[PDB]
Amino acid sequence: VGRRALIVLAHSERTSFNYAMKEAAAAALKKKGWEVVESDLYAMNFNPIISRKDITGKLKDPANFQYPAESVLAYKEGHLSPDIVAEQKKLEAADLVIFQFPLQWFGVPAILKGWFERVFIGEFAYTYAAMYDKGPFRSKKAVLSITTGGSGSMYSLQGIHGDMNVILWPIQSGILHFCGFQVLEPQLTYSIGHTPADARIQILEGWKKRLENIWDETPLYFAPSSLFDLNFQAGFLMKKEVQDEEKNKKFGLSVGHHLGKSIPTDNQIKAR
Amino acid sequence: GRRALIVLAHSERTSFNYAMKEAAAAALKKKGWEVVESDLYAMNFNPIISRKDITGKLKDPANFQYPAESVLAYKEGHLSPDIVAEQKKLEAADLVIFQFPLQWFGVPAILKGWFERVFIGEFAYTYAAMYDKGPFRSKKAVLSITTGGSGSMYSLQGIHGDMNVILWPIQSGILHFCGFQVLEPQLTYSIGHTPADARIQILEGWKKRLENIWDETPLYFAPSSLFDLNFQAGFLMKKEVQDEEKNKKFGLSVGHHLGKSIPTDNQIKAR
Amino acid sequence: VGRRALIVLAHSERTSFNYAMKEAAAAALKKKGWEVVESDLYAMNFNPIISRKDITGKLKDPANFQYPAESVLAYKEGHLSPDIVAEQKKLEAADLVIFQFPLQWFGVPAILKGWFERVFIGEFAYTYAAMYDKGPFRSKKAVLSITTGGSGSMYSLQGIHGDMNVILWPIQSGILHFCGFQVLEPQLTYSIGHTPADARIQILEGWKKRLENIWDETPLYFAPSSLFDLNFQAGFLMKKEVQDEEKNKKFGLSVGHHLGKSIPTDNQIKAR
Amino acid sequence: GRRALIVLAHSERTSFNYAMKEAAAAALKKKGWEVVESDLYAMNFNPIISRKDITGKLKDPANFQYPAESVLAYKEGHLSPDIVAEQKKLEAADLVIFQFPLQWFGVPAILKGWFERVFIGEFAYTYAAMYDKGPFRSKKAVLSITTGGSGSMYSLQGIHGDMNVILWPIQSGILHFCGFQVLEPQLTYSIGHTPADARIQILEGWKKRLENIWDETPLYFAPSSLFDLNFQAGFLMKKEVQDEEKNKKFGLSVGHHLGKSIPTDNQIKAR
Ligand SMILES: Cc1cc2nc3c(=O)[nH]c(=O)nc-3n(C[C@H](O)[C@H](O)[C@H](O)COP(=O)(O)OP(=O)(O)OC[C@H]3O[C@@H](n4cnc5c(N)ncnc54)[C@H](O)[C@@H]3O)c2cc1C
Ligand SMILES: Cc1cc2nc3c(=O)[nH]c(=O)nc-3n(C[C@H](O)[C@H](O)[C@H](O)COP(=O)(O)OP(=O)(O)OC[C@H]3O[C@@H](n4cnc5c(N)ncnc54)[C@H](O)[C@@H]3O)c2cc1C
Ligand SMILES: Cc1cc2nc3c(=O)[nH]c(=O)nc-3n(C[C@H](O)[C@H](O)[C@H](O)COP(=O)(O)OP(=O)(O)OC[C@H]3O[C@@H](n4cnc5c(N)ncnc54)[C@H](O)[C@@H]3O)c2cc1C
Ligand SMILES: Cc1cc2nc3c(=O)[nH]c(=O)nc-3n(C[C@H](O)[C@H](O)[C@H](O)COP(=O)(O)OP(=O)(O)OC[C@H]3O[C@@H](n4cnc5c(N)ncnc54)[C@H](O)[C@@H]3O)c2cc1C
Ligand SMILES: NC(=O)c1ccc[n+]([C@@H]2O[C@H](COP(=O)([O-])OP(=O)(O)OC[C@H]3O[C@@H](n4cnc5c(N)ncnc54)[C@H](O)[C@@H]3O)[C@@H](O)[C@H]2O)c1
């Protein structure tokens, strides 16, 4: 029939390049016969604060409330807040998830951060049994599309701000891959606010061209979970024999699994 | 007679996070500190940047840009009063303690929003004064983080990976960027599977540390003097500093790894 | 706690239980280091009728006068009547607002009703941009303290008068929450004039005990405004996908958002 | 030759509310009604209950209670003359029309005050005779409300919530409590966004309705016969009526929802 795509947008202004890049992605994907659902978080007045109000039924323990535990029960028993559930249905349907946002304080905007917190509940988005490459969204692909005010030189190995690969790691590994997603190469649009209108149009056309064949792309490299002992008594440490195979190599596996050695160039930006 | 701000991002008074805020307040007051708080959930703090944050005339309502508009609003004094209140707390504060649970490898959304609305240009950073030359070089900040995951999971060989990498965007990208000297984070791992007697110990450990907090060495970040702070040079590391570093085996920091090894616990232990 | 509290009182007699409960609240709060400001509306000879006299400057349109529009301009340009402005300053300062009044005709007294009408002006207390949980007083907490002549059985589900939750809804949702307030559990003191002296003393002591730790209480549940399309073309209706998630559930969200189903027990009286 | 009272709570003669008062007067006179008015703003009506409302000897000036004192003052005939004047209008009136703009989900303060000062015990209610057995069971009342908000906002799925809930305290708690049979309210939503052609239609609709107003079915309120009207029983619903209602899916009314569903438009449409 054709595949489904979710576009999460974290910018308040319709006049923004971020909004322009959401519209371009929708356009490009529909024209290739994709169904396209959106979460325009500001337009939705999405609520990004985790609270008791997120559970609409009986709390297991109202006197000693813990959001991890309570939210998971509420999912299983089906009395999560309906605004959460609506976003979860969009994700279950979605084969590709595009996150369009401006980098703010080296991270996702608060409203997108809150979306992850309220929507990516246990049992739904991760278990513990099944982390990382074995997680519930291993069927799905995700891509970050980020704009910055700072130039790309500032996020180079020798830039004042430092390696962009380090900045992306918590989001791409810690949030997206943790839940199973195969993470595609991020679309980095540097110093957008010093780019003249003719060149922005080019960037949009570049973005649209990429989305034509997005599904065929190689994902970023993360250490398979098979390299680790996935149980508590072992501490989720990297297997003793994998440490032995890696002792000799000069490069580490990834930004987070640098292993006290060099990080593979553009681990979080380019695939191999 | 120094001042301390405690920012707390947890909704429940029954939490260990709340317990660690109370312990810090206690310990600091007893050493003659003034202690101001921002309990963000109790304040029902609003973490979403919007036009409503500027209370006066916009420079350009048809083409609104939060960076530029917020900065004018600071200079002309028509920021939203809830923002201004937090800024006054910071101007007064010598030490800032951020108490929060790690959520999705980061600060909670409400604390993230606080940074976004409160750390406005000209007030918290300019670009002519970045990093060690920034407006808060007089001040010290420390993260106090709790996790659900065990510390083995955030070791070099842990499933989740090096905690130094996770802390970098916050400690360098937000705190140091604005000038703060960043102290060793208080990392309290897998708190919900720590027995009661050991939690009591952790609180007492926290209180003991805060007695002599001010004397501590800060974490190492590359001085901005190692870089060409102008656009034509690209804010790249000076050509002669690259020459001095060519030979060394370790990089400077997590973000300035320079394609080499990261100094062990760059974001966790001081030099 | 160097926090501020406003106590609005709508009873004419100093000999009243209502006055006794104002005094008890002031006592209890001061002793916990609160600043306490009062609006004793009868003692102030407060004027509760909206008129042109409420605007002291130039009317925008004297031939076709509309209090909503004119009052809002007068706030922005700073020429509201000084008696209104005085009350507004009390509100801006106040973290907690306590309304102490006798139920009169299933509602607030006329003088308190007038206070709402003259003091809760647009831009100050509400905009249509920011309604309900996004409103200007989301930082503040409010509580109703109501006395009745009728017994509590009369306002039970099977009482002659009917559910008290229905009676409170217009005030707590329509007035307090509309302006942003987090609304705490109302203090309902039923049939006070047929309570023996020893039990009245108990009620006062109960009230004082509650106010010690008032700030830590959970607020009443109102449907978040994030469940709705906050714009005119959509009709401020509940989002289409939230209605889909709620179609199946047996209980409605609140007294006003009952959705043609059962109302959550004591939605306007107890928190969850 | 029946009589009608029109109570109006709007200050401006240029208002749609005033236009709807004039239309009702017109329509009713033309059908041979006598029409008395209470234009509360024009009367400079005083809506605050005070001691000044009793003009004779108080029973207990040191411990004053408005319920008790006002009732004695009615029986002994020394109520304030402005109250008495309004009471005479009510005694004469067969139909009472309340024309007002919704203000804060309620009647305006001045109309609220009118109820408080005019609807005194013994005159408008006793505890002997509440609801359908009350003194005004001979009379009919109708609310004519204008709103600024659109009707979608007061639908089951509207931001503001069910308008049936909003009307309940007024129609049941004030009007029916005193005996009135309450007719379907005339709801004129978002009048200030209605073009002139459609306003003319609404007025004509109002006038057409008033021609045959007296024949209309009233709104459904639970008869007081479903309850034990005595204090020892607590004015609770009879044990055998609860038994008849156990099985039904819909409750009786908005206030007597009985923990179940409210009958659709209980306070807006007759059954
Ligand atoms: C709180 C906060 C923190 C921040 N922190 C960081 C940080 O840590 N690091 C960092 O690098 N940056 C940071 N920034 C900067 C931020 O990343 C940039 O402001 C953002 O990336 C710019 O993207 P935009 O879509 O908002 O741009 P806009 O300025 O909204 O858009 C750029 C230009 O494109 C124009 N345009 C829009 N659509 C079109 C179209 N279809 N065709 C042609 N022209 C078009 C616009 O009118 C405008 O002139 C921060 C900003 C904020 C508010
Ligand atoms: C949305 C979300 C995302 C998350 N993502 C991550 C993630 O990416 N990585 C990660 O590692 N974790 C994650 N977590 C987990 C989070 O780090 C932990 O839940 C948190 O750190 C636990 O601290 P707490 O204060 O919340 O614990 P609590 O359960 O509130 O406290 C722990 C125990 O201490 C007790 N206690 C309370 N006060 C005292 C006292 N005074 N003295 C002694 N004992 C006391 C409590 O009663 C309880 O038994 C996430 C959680 C959420 C909600
Ligand atoms: C116009 C009007 C309409 C009304 N409509 C309704 C209605 O629709 N529904 C309804 O249920 N009720 C209604 N009522 C009744 C009203 O709610 C009650 O009369 C009111 O709540 C009683 O409170 P009070 O403070 O006036 O009581 P009071 O009678 O003034 O006080 C109660 C008792 O407590 C004593 N007392 C005072 N101070 C102290 C103290 N410090 N310690 C101990 N004892 C003390 C007093 O002397 C007295 O004996 C209405 C009343 C009016 C005037
Ligand atoms: C303090 C306060 C609180 C409020 N609270 C609420 C609330 O909680 N909820 C809510 O929904 N609303 C609320 N409102 C708004 C109120 O409900 C509306 O403003 C009011 O109902 C609109 O009717 P009006 O008579 O005032 O209209 P107007 O605007 O005075 O008149 C309506 C239009 O009809 C025209 N018109 C006048 N006479 C005629 C005629 N003879 N023929 C044809 N056209 C004519 C007028 O010129 C105008 O264009 C509140 C208002 C105030 C002042
Ligand atoms: N990390 C951050 O978020 C960050 C840091 C610094 C600056 N900024 C943003 O960048 C702005 C910097 O402005 P500025 O005063 O430094 O000037 P500018 O950088 O916008 O213009 C001057 C410089 O631009 C460069 N440049 C390259 N191509 C150019 C072209 N075609 N035309 C003109 N200049 C060209 C040149 O090196 C020149 O020295 C800030 O106002 C802010 O918006 C963001």
Ligand SMILES: NC(=O)c1ccc[n+]([C@@H]2O[C@H](COP(=O)([O-])OP(=O)(O)OC[C@H]3O[C@@H](n4cnc5c(N)ncnc54)[C@H](O)[C@@H]3O)[C@@H](O)[C@H]2O)c1
């Ligand atoms: N709810 C309450 O508690 C309360 C309290 C007091 C007053 N009120 C009432 O609420 C009113 C608030 O006014 P409002 O916010 O409803 O005004 P509004 O936003 O409805 O007025 C502007 C209208 O014009 C339309 N419009 C104009 N140009 C347009 C265009 N080019 N394309 C599309 N649509 C266009 C807008 O969509 C909108 O419907 C007050 O004046 C008062 O009457 C309500």
